[model samples]
Target chain A: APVVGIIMGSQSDWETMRHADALLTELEIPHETLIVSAFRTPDRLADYARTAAERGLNVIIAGAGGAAHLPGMCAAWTRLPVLGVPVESRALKGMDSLLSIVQMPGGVPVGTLAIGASGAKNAALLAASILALYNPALAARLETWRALQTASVPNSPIT
Target chain B: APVVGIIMGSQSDWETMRHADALLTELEIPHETLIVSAFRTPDRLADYARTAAERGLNVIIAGAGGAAHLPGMCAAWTRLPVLGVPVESRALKGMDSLLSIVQMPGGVPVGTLAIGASGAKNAALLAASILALYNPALAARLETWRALQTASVPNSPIT
Candidate 1:
């Protein structure tokens, strides 16, 4: 089975990345996370990407704020599907991060999720979807999860 | 010939939407502007969207901040393709705006540009691209603009 790996650019991202952790936990998916900053620790990022596949990691979920280059840089080193979550920052917010992650020139593709918790949750779902491509059991779990999500949405107006 | 119409959610968005004006001016494309709020002034927005096509408008470029629903709402109402620019905001740092604009439900898609000024500039280019779809003159102009952009990038780092 392909294990999901979660990485973020900073410890500050823990506030948002925790959502990804919670979602994956909800699905009973065993995963690992690390604080891997591109600007702060570039070499660590390089090493992580180089050994991710060999370490049995199937999909990579990377969240970052500000310049948010962690996801793209990781994608550059590996062929595994990369899902990027833009952690809202203080200045331009996650807008800068979202563009840096989503607007990669052709050839390199990052499956970008929404910003914040919703995005965090989707990143976990996206990883599940990618893994489901090869595992039928995981695929069934994904379908059930999606149905539960749909059922949870309110059908009527609050007023 | 398709004319670019720039619409923004609020007067505050003028700070970011100005980039669209600058690009259109540089390209010498005949364009118009409007302050059309999606949430605050729903009636005005509906009127603008419903008549945008008949008003000799070929492409619509919309910008918004906060929840930034203007661009997506415009796309929903009109057949004239909409390009969305997420203006940088103080709160959620425009991440809220980006997600609201980018994650349009499956059927209706907004050709989302980058966030803030870069996004505003790209929205202009995307609008020009749509215009170039039928006008060979505009297409040639766009090609020239792209070449100039490429040529302007220096090979070596600037000191």
Candidate 2:
């Protein structure tokens, strides 16, 4: 069963959410990715969010553009920790999406990352960090992955 | 009666949120300014937001730093359009506050502005613009104010 659930608003969000998908795959984390719009498909959103925990999901990484609300709504329904990524938009440049996900009220929290691809990747890494707390094997793998990322950075700007 | 409400997380946020208060005053927009923390005083924040609409306020401008939940929580209980200003913090600057305030789910919306003073000023102006839609007098004032701002700009870097 998948531990992390990656949900985006629509197919348009695939471009951004794919980064999270890739990161999770690279980390060898078992996760399911799907489309769930908060506005267009409220029923689907609620259904997915409400049952995520019972479905054996540990964390949810949601990405959306424009009037993005998937992440916050997901957090509202699920007890599991939710992370948000604001997909870049043409008009406001994802500022609209960013705010919609991050400004969740007090009771609920959607741990938000930066905008665009960086945010997507970070959300996956963060979820892995959370999951690592209980699983020793995953923790070992994640430690190595984190170390590689740090070690891969060139000491100099020179290519 | 105060048509606008300017709220901050605490005294620290006052420095930044005060910009909005001053702008509202300069624009002759009657507003109330107060401190209400989402973490420190949950009950106060809830009451303030819930009663704002019935209290005769047309708009609420909330500002906060760090896990700035004041704006989001305020918007949760009020129907009035809430504009958020992100007060720059000592640690991550205002990115923490900015994301915290801007990210609201779909059903509830908080028209968010930039970080720090610029955001503060813009929040007041945005509120004034919203109010101006109904008040002809304020509309004219805002129109002239915008024109003055445009015309007053330096034509060249030399000047």
Candidate 3:
């Protein structure tokens, strides 16, 4: 069973959400991905959220655009730590999606990431970090990833 | 009569949406504010969006966070130009809110601004720009605002 559940509002979002999947793969984190729309398939969302913990999932990452409610609604249904990735939209460029996932009410919470690819990558890293709390080997891998990332940053801006 | 409709998803949004309010006030643009939640009070949102144009609202500025459907939904209901401001969300630091507001489908368009105060201020400026397309006096003021904004950017970051 996967420890991380990656869900997106639509298949198109795979372009962005795949970054999260790739990073998790790089870290050898067992995960899974699904396309679930909050608006179109509310029932599916509820079912997924309710059973996530029981299925042995520790974290959930959701990506969507244009009134993206998948992440918040997922949080509404589950106790697992939920991370949101705002997929860039055609018209407004994902701002609507970003707000929809990030701004949960006072009680429920969805830890949000940046827009598009960066957000997806960060969400996976964040999930790894959360799981690292109890897994020493994963923690060490995360540390190496962080060090590699830091080392990759150039000393100055490229021309 | 108000030409600009400045609406927010909820009263809590007033804290960040107020920046747009303040900027519009500074620009002396006639606008109105309303609290309309897409999920909590869909009826109010529908009513507001449907009648805004007939009510003399030429431009709509909608602010919301976390599943921010306000702006895109508003655009969906009306032909008037809509501006979206992604109120900074607590968990994702407004990234979620930003994407939610910015990403709209192809059929509807919601011109989005930055997140939080800067976005709010820019939304007002953008509204003024839209209105200025037909109003000479407003155009003059907008030009001045832009000039002042340009002048205010420092040449270098503070030490």
Best by TM-score: 1
| DockQ, computed on Cα atoms, for candidate 1 | 0.04
Error of 1 at B128 (Å): 0.7
Worst 10 residues of 2 chain B by lDDT: B89-98
Instruction: Give the Cα error of residue B119 in candidate 3, in Å.
Output: 24
Query: What is candidate 2's lDDT per residue for B1-159, written digit by digit as tens?
Result: 999998887777777877888888888999888877776567777898999988999999998886788889999989999999988965456787888878787898989999989999999999999999999999999999999999999978984
Sort by lDDT, top down from the best: 2, 3, 1
How much is A37 displaced in model 3, in angstroms? Answer: 1.1
Better of 1 and 2 by lDDT: 2
Off by over 4 Å in 2: B1-159
Better of 2 and 3 by DockQ: 3
TM-score of the first chain in candidate 1 relative to the native first chain: 0.94
The digit string of per-residue lDDT tens for model 1 on A1-159 reads: 439889987667888889888888787778888877676567778998888989999899999987789999999988888999999966565777789899999998899999888899899988888878888887898899889889999989999
Between candidates 1 and 2, the one scoring higher on DockQ is 1
What's model 2's lDDT at A127?
96
Error of 2 at A85 (Å): 0.7
**Which candidate order results from sorting by DockQ in descending order?**
1, 3, 2
Q: Residue A102 of model 2: what lDDT?
A: 87
Docking quality of model 2: it rates as incorrect
